[PDB]
Design a protein around this nucleic acid. Structure first.
Ligand SMILES: [Mg+2]
Ligand SMILES: [Mg+2]
Ligand SMILES: [Mg+2]
Ligand SMILES: [Mg+2]
Ligand SMILES: [Mg+2]
Ligand SMILES: [Mg+2]
Ligand SMILES: [Mg+2]
Ligand SMILES: [Mg+2]
Ligand SMILES: [Zn+2]
Lengths: 135, 102, 83, 214, 137, 24
RNA sequence: GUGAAAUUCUUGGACCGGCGCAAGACGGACCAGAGCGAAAGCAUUUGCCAAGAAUGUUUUCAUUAAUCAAGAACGAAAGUCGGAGGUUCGAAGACGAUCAGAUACCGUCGUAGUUCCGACCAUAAACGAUGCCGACCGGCGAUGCGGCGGCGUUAUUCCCAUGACCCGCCGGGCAGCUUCCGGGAAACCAAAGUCUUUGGGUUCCGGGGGGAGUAUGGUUGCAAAGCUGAAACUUAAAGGAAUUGACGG
């Protein structure tokens, strides 16, 4: 127990990731070497604590976005996940369930009298409320 | 300062409610005010349920329960930790606490 | 609904409203004609009868009065009378 | 100096014909010496027994008093004395958010048995009931109670102690209450909770013999 | 005979055990099917000599074992049980010694029938002791 | 001092004053 | 029996268990932010006696109304008087414990009392610490009663009513949740809102804190006491609501 990173290392790791994202990578030993010159960190222990956390976040941001944000990452994430792009729209059903109350609503709208919608038998019982109180 | 809208008792359309007695100290407390706790207890506790079930002559016997309704004056309910003091906001909540079933 | 048109309330809420609370008072009770079975003539019966009504021919009881509206006994034909 | 268990003797108690099981169990009593008589000591003994003990596949929450009226040798003939529901059952039937109805009658049996019958019933909520509490109005309770009085006095006043006991073993009286009362207010938790005796027809010996036999 | 019946192996003998488990004392009382005749009665007060542990589970189980060996001495095998609290207007719950005495009887080579509560419950009692202000301690 | 017991003490003093005045 | 004990009851059977008998109290669970009543208050079944709200009403009368000095009926508990009854509980009192003390809290006993009838008393934190009548001003889900409707399930039957549910609506209620309506010192309140943009009608009633609900006068009461009700003198605060802290057996 007792390896929790503090806000000092945590925040500094996030800032250098955002400002220098392409110069970083998955290797800890290269990350600490770039951190030597991309920022002025006085202590060696603080330096490689920063680099160790940067390596951990690189392993995270490579497989999903985090609280930190990269402008290039945002555009790539919208560029990907374009759509499931089904061969047909998901809502072009040949038959659509329609209650008699909605069927007369479409008639009063004048847009009814179509073939795709089918009318169903209205449900009977009128019981739709949960019993009150405990159980 | 009025601490509770209902004055700590469930008396709205009445003028007087018959008193009942605290089971712990035997104190006259109105029936609408005392803390009521209907408790169902096993006749045989878990430490002896196996001994009784094994030693029983009957092949299949369900142990009966205890059906006693407990009335506590608020002093005794606080002392027995049946009811706990709550914050000003949490006081208004009237739902029973969860049974911790899952 | 600040700008509700009280000048012309729609009839579904006008019937919904209490009897005295409408824009103009209009009683809910009405007059209906009752045809005594086994008889020939037509008698006038209040829909909210308090007394037992018996048309002269029909010696049986026509309406059994209760709290709100009369109980038309079986075999009686009823019909409204001019709004 | 010596324990009385040396001079105690064991007698076996039997059951009336209403129950398919005869032997309830065994008792003990002191012997006969001087004025005190072993038969007289065993006279008037009440043995609370369970109907589950006396019956093969019937309910267990019903108990019977079964006083012994006569002893003949090592066997103690026993007739019906009273019934009572167990405390676990009668306490569990009292649920909140519903109305309890309690009735009590006094009936003279054709034989001469004066019985005090206590019946209890509870209102029933429906399957589609969304309202939390299923209460009964006071007039509904009065109608149900009065009807419960009369369809429980008719089942006993026109019959004998033999028929009444063998018909309350399956509690046909209670089911008669439920099916009649469902036209007014539906009930489910209806049982004859207790009966007790008040008067007896002068202790006829022949009636006990045909009670255990023909 | 010989401080017991002559019942064969097919049938067993049923006793009745009244466990009056209150606070400050616990009674275990074995009787016949009517309760008119008694076999043994042992209580914590006559088993512990501290005047405080009369209701302790330590004294209650010792009472249960003593009536158990006496019951086996009389050949009693089965035992319907009647648990009973103080009742009346006072407390309606069994004391500490109920479970210890119950467990001791089962583990002392005894057989158990039906356990039922004969606690006295008033329709509505008299004036309960303590005054209207309770027992201020 | 509790106002109820102040009231009771006042009642006792009023009885003393009535007794003194009656004697005179 | 208590925290631990003790006073106290016990070989005469104490306690326990069973069967009966008597007594006078008492009506659990069901019993709820549920009902009724002007409040106080009211809880086993049945009957009798009158009374009452709300709902229903295309009935009658036609302003007959609202609040009310004086006056009047009722009015928890305790208390007083007389007579019955005194189970339990229990002021006073005694004793045992505890304590430095313990006139107490705890335990045993027990008087008046607690119970019913009749006659008084007229006081409660008699509280919603919140006058009554009327008008208006948000929403929502419930619940009690009455009424009006509507898919359906269930009770019986050969058909409807009629009950038990389900979904709604109307009116009177006990209330509840929510809201930057508005108010308020705030706590909070759909009333404590419609208030410097101040006037719907009408009762009671307060004027810094004490002295003091005291003295005196009158009046009511068997009494205890009730109603009405000062002054001298003294004092710079007393208070209400919230905030932070400190502390809590
Ligand atoms: Mg406070
Ligand atoms: Mg009050
Ligand atoms: Mg002693
Ligand atoms: Mg009084
Ligand atoms: Mg008297
Ligand atoms: Mg006492
Ligand atoms: Mg006014
Ligand atoms: Mg002043
Ligand atoms: Zn208490």
């Amino acid at each position: 127990m007792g390896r929790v990173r503090t806000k000092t290392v945590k925040k500094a790791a996030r800032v250098i990731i955002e400002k220098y994202y392409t110069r970083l990578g998955n290797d800890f030993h290269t990350n600490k070497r770039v951190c030597e010159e991309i920022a002025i960190i006085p202590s060696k222990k603080l330096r490689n604590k920063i680099a160790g956390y940067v390596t951990h976040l690189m392993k995270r941001i490579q497989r999903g976005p985090v609280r930190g944000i990269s402008i290039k990452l945002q555009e790539e994430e919208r560029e990907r996940r374009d759509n499931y792009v089904p061969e047909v729209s998901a809502l072009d059903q040949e038959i659509i369930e329609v209650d008699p109350d909605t069927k007369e609503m479409l008639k009063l709208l004048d847009f009814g009298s179509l073939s795709n919608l089918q009318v169903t038998q209205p449900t009977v019982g009128m019981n739709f409320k949960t019993p009150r109180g405990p159980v | 300062t009025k601490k509770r809208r209902n004055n700590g008792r469930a008396k709205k359309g009445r003028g007087h409610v018959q008193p009942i007695r605290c089971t712990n100290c035997a104190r006259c407390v109105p029936k609408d005010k005392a803390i009521k706790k209907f408790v169902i207890r096993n006749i045989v506790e878990a430490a002896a349920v196996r001994d009784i079930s094994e030693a029983s002559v009957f092949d299949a016997y369900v142990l009966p329960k205890l059906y006693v309704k407990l009335h506590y004056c608020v002093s005794c309910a606080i002392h027995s930790k049946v009811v706990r003091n709550r914050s000003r906001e949490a006081r208004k909540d009237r739902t029973p606490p969860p049974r911790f079933r899952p | 609904p600040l700008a509700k048109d009280l000048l012309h309330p729609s009839p579904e809420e006008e019937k919904r409203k209490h009897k005295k609370k409408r824009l103009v008072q209009s009683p809910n009770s009405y007059f209906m004609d009752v045809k005594c079975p086994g008889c020939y003539k037509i008698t006038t019966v209040f829909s909210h009868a308090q007394t037992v009504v018996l048309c002269v021919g029909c010696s049986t009881v026509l309406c059994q009065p209760t709290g709100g509206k009369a109980r038309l006994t079986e075999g009686c034909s009823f019909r409204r009378k001019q709004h | 100096v010596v324990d009385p268990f040396s001079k105690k003797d064991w007698y076996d108690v039997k059951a009336p014909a209403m129950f398919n099981i005869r032997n309830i169990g065994k008792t003990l009593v002191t012997r006969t010496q001087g004025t005190k008589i072993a038969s007289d000591g065993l006279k008037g003994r009440v043995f609370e027994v369970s109907l589950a003990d006396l019956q093969n596949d019937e309910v267990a929450f019903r108990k019977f008093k079964l006083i012994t009226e006569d002893v003949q040798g090592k066997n103690c003939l026993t007739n019906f004395h009273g019934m009572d529901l167990t405390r676990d059952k009668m306490c569990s039937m009292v649920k909140k958010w519903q109305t309890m109805i309690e009735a009590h009658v006094d009936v003279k049996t054709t034989d001469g048995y004066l019985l005090r019958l206590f019946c209890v019933g509870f209102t029933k909520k429906r399957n589609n009931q969304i309202r939390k509490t299923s209460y009964a109005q006071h007039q509904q309770v009065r109608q149900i109670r009065k009807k419960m009085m009369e369809i429980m006095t008719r089942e006993v006043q026109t019959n004998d102690l033999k028929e009444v006991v063998n018909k309350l073993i399956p509690d046909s009286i209670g089911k008669d209450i439920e099916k009649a009362c469902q036209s007014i207010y539906p009930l489910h938790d209806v049982f004859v909770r207790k009966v007790k005796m008040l008067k007896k027809p002068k202790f006829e010996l022949g009636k006990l013999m045909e009670l255990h036999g023909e | 005979i010989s401080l017991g019946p002559q019942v064969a192996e097919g049938e067993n003998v049923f006793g009745v055990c009244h466990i009056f488990a209150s606070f400050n004392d616990t009674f275990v009382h074995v009787t016949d099917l009517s309760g008119k005749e008694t076999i043994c009665r042992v209580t914590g007060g006559m088993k512990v000599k501290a005047d405080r542990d009369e209701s302790s589970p330590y004294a209650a189980m010792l009472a249960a074992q003593d009536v158990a060996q006496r019951c086996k001495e009389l050949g009693i095998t089965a035992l319907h049980i009647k648990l009973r609290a103080t009742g009346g207007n006072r407390t309606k719950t069994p004391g500490p010694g109920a479970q210890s005495a119950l467990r001791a009887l089962a583990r002392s080579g005894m057989k158990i029938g039906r356990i039922e509560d004969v606690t006295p419950i008033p329709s509505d009692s008299t004036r309960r002791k303590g005054g209207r202000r309770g027992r201020r301690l | 001092m509790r106002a109820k017991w102040r009231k009771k003490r006042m009642r006792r003093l009023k009885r003393k004053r009535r007794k003194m005045r009656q004697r005179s």
